[PDB]
Design a protein around this ligand. Structure first.
Ligand SMILES: *[C@@H]1O[C@H](CO)[C@@H](O)[C@H](O)[C@H]1NC(C)=O
Ligand SMILES: *[C@@H]1O[C@H](CO)[C@@H](O)[C@H](O)[C@H]1NC(C)=O
Ligand SMILES: *[C@@H]1O[C@H](CO)[C@@H](O)[C@H](O)[C@H]1NC(C)=O
Lengths: 164, 156, 156, 156, 164, 164
């Protein structure tokens, strides 16, 4: 339904309605009396259906290099996130790790996690220092197209002209 | 009948200043900010009831420079908890804390907290106030910058 | 009927980690570690009795390199005291503290402590927990790394 | 019948020393320095009445060189709160705090504070004492350097 | 008078004397009983006439580069001040700002405030770095005395010989 | 004896036995009842005969450059000591001072105290920087053996060949 719950007034145990996100609970249903649900106060909120008499304070404030992704509604808590390139590290928004001209991104940095780098396995490479770019595999000149001209290491692709 | 307060910084209105500057801006009724049988007025926490109170304060300072250094790198980061009264206009310091600090350009971010606490005989009409140096560096978080009091004892 | 706790770090089981990491390992019944009418369970201090509690925490960090420098020299040393509940799965921070720090190779040893305290309305079923950054640097001494609570007031 | 103390440093008689040195010199009856149903004797705060006490301490260190550098620039700044007894001659540390610090010659002044607090079961005849490193750097202000105790609970 | 105040004993409201600086109040007047004023204890004081039963503690201690201007009397609180050249900045006595060889003192540093410097407006100057010296105006050679020889900027006066 | 002490039950004052190291006191003797002494719990201890109902917690934990000299028994508290060359300075185990190639050890550094150095008086010396080595006195070539060849300062012994 809207969703109910037990209360157990003097006599029996009753099916009362739950309070919607955006409200707190003022009075329990009582048979002939419904659940009285008030809206949250100016800086509080509730995500889900529930039964608490109290609401939640919107928290915390955003940090310097953070922006308000989700503003504080009676229905949602504020959501703060680190701007592009940065993840939240303890108290501060720090730039994602750059993956050295040798290595490649194996785990996309997020607003919450750093970018995780690794070494380019045999047969892979990256020509750059990027916080975003993965290990790309040696282009197989051998087959599709032309011939090999220079072996590729972990830092360099196969250089593959079309003359032996 | 056992009064308390826990006031959290209201970052809406924080002053600039180059000495000890008074912090008049606090929440008293929101999130962790609670008050009972004391009154928060004109920037100060008023005592309504004689007794012995534990007073305490936690102040956080923080800076994150998008690039380069701080304008000044050597800082005094201090907090002062003061007692005043209508009659004894002059303020007296109950508790003091903090640290000198070199927030060099070698790092783009910096954080420091101060905590003080103490047991004090208070009478009605007495008022507690907070002063700090370098207010513009204050952390605006309720879990960061706050002060408070609770009655422990009667006088006698 | 006036509940308290003083929990001291149990260094037996300390985690590594590069963000805020939860400290679940504490003594509750040994040396200074004492508990009454609250329960320490699954890493958290449970409140059994409504009321106003003073919460506090003292965290020590330390390093002594036999030679050379730290692997990373710039540190965030932070503590977070959090409130959780069965119903409100989401944690909320009551208190925060610490300092950024340059533990340079110019010195082979380094020590830093954090202290936080505050007055908080708690209800039964609510739980207090500690998180810190750089847990591996923790001082394992009962006089060094500990947190606690005592009931001061009834609600009403 | 709810004992307390708040003792403020008496800078008249501060020792030099290069380890943990005991601080025996405190006011007990002046300015903020107050005592009730405990006794301050021979440098220690004596407990007269069983119970649970909140203990706390705030220590400030400071230096201002008229010119040049400190003689030694790398410092350990620590405080130790200890419990002793007639019967258990040996001291035991209840709480510890402080920080290593580089008070370089790049700045002619330096300030640092430590704060510790904790909840402890005490019995009559037990005594609290303060030790610190680098005592000569102590701030002599009553609002700066002090320690204290108040009874919160009976044992049972 | 010596100055009186209301008390209101059992019956009426009375005119009691106030307590002089240097004392605290022990007993309220009572008609046939005067205000009983005791001297302050050894480290306390009172500035003015008053009515409090308690005295004030002399405070705080002087800092390193401070000196006791006013010693602690039963009548006065101790007064500590920063020595010449220095103002109290938060916890320490710091040397007054030097006004660059370009600028001049517009606000005398005090034991409580730094010296405030500013730029020498058009027609002024200062040849030195001083924490005390103001902007002096270009000497008008033109009239009184001789003739101009070198225009003066913000750092230099008019150089004014007496030959064209 | 095993050693006794007063108690003073309802009637008289009695000679009760004391509790041995390794135990705490559970019940006072009572004439026909002996002192009941239990062993300490798993992390506690007692050094000596005594009467307390409570035992002592083993403490504190050893520091990085420390080693457990004495493990924690029901009879002894743990004992931690700084390794060779180092003394406990406040929170850390630091290397003993080296006595300069000029000076000599006058007070052996211990696990608790630094080595104290001093200057080599007239007629003494040390050729090295040692944290252990004392001031040795000028070898008297003059008598036993040969003749003097080079005066010895505070850094150098008498060089004493056997030709004038
Ligand atoms: C990979 O190839 C480049 C270009 O041929 C070369 O400069 C580099 O040294 C190679 N990598 C290694 C470490 O062998
Ligand atoms: C002012 O005059 C002096 C001397 O003539 C000169 O050296 C200086 O550059 C002048 N100031 C400026 C910035 O024009
Ligand atoms: C002591 O003797 C050595 C070798 O002769 C010499 O080099 C040194 O200068 C002398 N010490 C002093 C300071 O006279």
């Amino acid at each position: 339904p809207k969703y109910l719950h037990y209360d157990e007034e003097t006599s029996h145990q009753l099916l009362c309605d739950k309070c919607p996100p955006g409200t707190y609970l003022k009075q329990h249903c009582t048979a002939k009396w419904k659940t009285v649900c008030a809206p949250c106060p100016d800086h509080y909120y509730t995500d889900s259906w529930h039964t608490s008499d109290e609401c939640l304070y919107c928290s915390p404030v955003c940090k310097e290099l953070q922006y308000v992704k989700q503003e504080c509604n009676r229905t949602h808590n504020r959501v703060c996130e680190c701007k592009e390139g940065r993840y939240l590290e303890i108290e501060f928004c720090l730039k994602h790790r750059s993956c050295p001209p040798g290595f490649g991104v194996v785990q996309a940095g997020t607003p919450e996690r750093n970018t995780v780098c690794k070494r380019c396995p045999d047969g892979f490479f990256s020509n750059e220092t990027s916080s975003k770019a993965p290990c790309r595999k040696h282009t197989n000149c051998s087959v599709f197209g032309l011939l090999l001209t220079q072996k590729g290491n972990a830092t360099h692709d196969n250089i593959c002209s079309h003359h032996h | 009948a056992q009064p308390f307060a826990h006031l959290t910084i209201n970052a809406t209105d924080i002053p600039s200043g180059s000495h000890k500057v008074s912090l008049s801006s606090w929440y008293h009724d929101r999130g962790w900010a609670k008050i009972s049988n004391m009154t928060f007025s004109n920037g100060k926490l008023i005592v309504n009831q004689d007794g012995f109170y534990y007073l305490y304060a936690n102040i956080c300072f923080r800076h994150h420079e998008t690039s380069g250094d701080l304008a000044t790198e050597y800082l005094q980061l201090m907090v002062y908890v003061t007692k005043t009264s209508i009659k004894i206009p002059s303020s007296h310091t109950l508790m003091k804390g903090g640290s000198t600090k070199y927030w060099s350009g070698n790092s783009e971010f910096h954080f420091y907290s101060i905590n003080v606490g103490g047991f004090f005989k208070l009478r009605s009409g007495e008022e507690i106030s907070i002063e700090v140096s370098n207010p513009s560096l204050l952390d605006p978080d309720q879990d960061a910058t706050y002060f408070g009091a609770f009655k422990v004892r009667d006088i006698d």
